[PDB]
């Protein structure tokens with residue numbers, strides 16, 4: 001990229017998020033987040049990092065949205081709660097009117113080029129939708145479908161995702177669009193999504209079948225304490241067998257560790273996370 | 284001039300969802316209300332689970348500060364389970380968590396706060412902004428701010444590599460569990476941690492601490508506002524031995540000009556102005572309840588209103604540094620003299636008024652970052668490569684426990700009650716809860732609400748100081764509400 005190249009507009013809306021999907025993106029090694037922001041995309045609205053504030057920030061997003069109707073990318077971090085008429089997530093106020101996450105997704109969703117549901121909360125509901133919750137936390141694709149909004153969705157799950165999955169999905173999409181235009185490009189992206197909406201380049205391989213401790217699993221040699229790094233982690237709760245992600249190879253945080261080496265995989269990229277992956281510390 | 288009422292939603296360059304509404308009369312804020320507008324309900328989501336799951340689930344309160352929740356949760360579980368964490372595991376935990384203090388403070392000052400004082404490059408997300416943003420720095424100093432913002436993106440990423448070395452990944456560590464830490468530090472990985480730490484130390488010492496004092500010296504007016512109650516809380520953090528009695532930050536309360544002990548039984552959470560059922564008001568956390576009431580008349584936040592013996596207190600670096608009164612950094616002492624004409628040796632030598640101020644909170648955070656370097660250096664000397672860091676305790680049928688620590692933004696406790704080997708109750712009283720809460724049942728404002736009183740708004744069309752004050756507290760509304 002260059003400082004003076006084409007950089008499409010992106011709005012980043014937080015629903016019932018923890019900001020961890022934003023923070024994981026800040027950890028991108030290559031391209032660095034500085035290069036992503038200054039050379040790859042134009043991050044026009046993001047509540048955690050943008051200069052302006054309040055109604056002025058909302059109106060800025062609305063002005064860009066009008067100029068780039070049908071063409072901006074919409075990132076969602078967090079789930080969308082529908083109970084209590086949307087009141088469990090208010091994201092702004094303008095014209096003396098509060099704007100719920102429900103409202104915001106109904107406003108901008110129809111006019112995005114594509115919606116990137118970043119993180120398991122946005123993709124699948126995640127922890128806010130788990131047993132014991134009461135906010136009607138809803139995944140992006142379901143919310144949009146329920147409301148008749150047909151904009152394409154790509155899921156980039158994880159709790160959090162690896163930055164390479166987020167940046168890499170953006171790169172995949174922008175490449176496809178460069179080659180084919182917007183509709184042709186998005187069609188090429190959809191072709192490489194699995195049945196859970198995930199890009200098969202990153203989510204197409206199972207952790208367990210590629211795990212360095214697979215021989216130990218097959219031999220029945222199981223660690224009885226977390227600090228025994230020789231045995232397989234299955235009896236300690238490892239969910240690698242049920243998890244589709246490339247963590248075994250790219251690892252985490254500049255390659256310095258990953259969940260299976262350190263402790264256990266908790267299946268954080270899967271549509272049933274957390275409840276279908278719990279208890280975490282037994283099989 | 285008369286009244287203007289200003290609503291700001293979203294308040295940006297904080298974490299999470301916050302609305303601030305202020306009443307301005309004659310150029311000053313005369314009233315304030317803070318609203319945490321997003322709720323998830325972790326305290327109810329947790330019920331019925333294997334208690335060990337909590338140390339993963341609770342981290343998702345907060346992707347900026349997940350190590351703090353991890354820590355509070357495992358300490359609570361350790362107590363409930365009767366788990367005796369090995370000495371080397373205590374130290375390993377401190378290395379995992381301490382590295383995120385560095386990350387969080389650097390993120391806060393540069394990536395959230397610095398644009399309050401620094402004009403970024405002429406492209407989103409640095410523009411557009413208020414036409415009169417009150418950006419006072421010379422071209423050279425402004426450029427230093429931008430250059431350091433950019434460098435800090437790499438430094439904070441390196442801090443997360445440090446966290447992940449023994450924590451597994453970050454955000455959302457795998458490496459802290461009931462019973463200790465899941466990965467014994469190896470000699471090789473301790474070399475890796477130290478090498479990264481050296482880079483972070485150099486950035487903190489040479490860039491961050493000096494830039495805060497230098498920018499502060501161009502905004503001296505910002506030490507004169509934002510006092511609020513001048514009342515603080517610290518509950519203790521980073522245990523320094525296995526006794527449970529000695530911590531890097533020792534507990535204490537400060538209010539009405541007096542130091543007092545911290546007794547956690549004096550914490551009560553009020554809900555009159557919060558969206559929770561009225562019958563749940565006034566409960567100590569050991570008996571806490573979380574029953575949302577999003578339509579309740581008069582309420583304006585999903586943040587409960589915690590009070591300490593009736594007092595509205597603030598938390599965070601200022602609170603800890605004021606309560607503990609450590610020596611100031613060498614560069615802080617020097618720059619206070621050179622740039623402010625202030626002679627100071629220990630933190631309280633700033634005086635109560637300047638410490639409890641908008642800019643004083645930024646200074647406290649920079650000083651605390653420097654202070655944490657020494658703690659981490661100490662842990663790197665104390666740790667023993669190869670020595671076991673975890674025990675594997677059976678889940679109890681019936682038990683309770685409380686974990687107390689200090690998140691980067693302030694005091695944090697988690698309380699767990701286990702019945703039939705499952706979570707019966709789980710209550711969280713977090714840092715930004717103490718800072719960013721609404722009025723209590725007597726109408727007394729939360730700490731930031733009160734600190735807004737007196738903030739200058741000489742230009743209602745560019746009311747920049749309202750959110751500048753809020754940002755000094757490093758709010759995290761995910762944590763505040765959970």
Ligand code: SF4
Nearest residue numbers: 018020119120121159
């Ligand atoms: S997916 Fe996980 S890391 Fe991302 S917003 Fe949800 S809880 Fe946070």
Ligand code: SF4
Nearest residue numbers: 208211232233238240
């Ligand atoms: S450690 Fe986990 S992913 Fe690896 S072989 Fe064992 S069960 Fe499978």
Ligand code: SF4
Nearest residue numbers: 247259265266267268
């Ligand atoms: S190893 Fe498992 S828990 Fe860790 S990031 Fe990958 S999918 Fe998530």
Ligand code: FCO
Nearest residue numbers: 348690691692715762
């Ligand atoms: N730091 C942090 Fe998060 C907040 N507030 C917690 O606890």
Ligand SMILES: [Cl-]
Nearest residue numbers: 348350351383
């Ligand atoms: Cl933390």
Ligand SMILES: [Fe+2]
Nearest residue numbers: 710711712765
């Ligand atoms: Fe709570």
Ligand SMILES: [S]
Nearest residue numbers: 345348759762
């Ligand atoms: S936080």
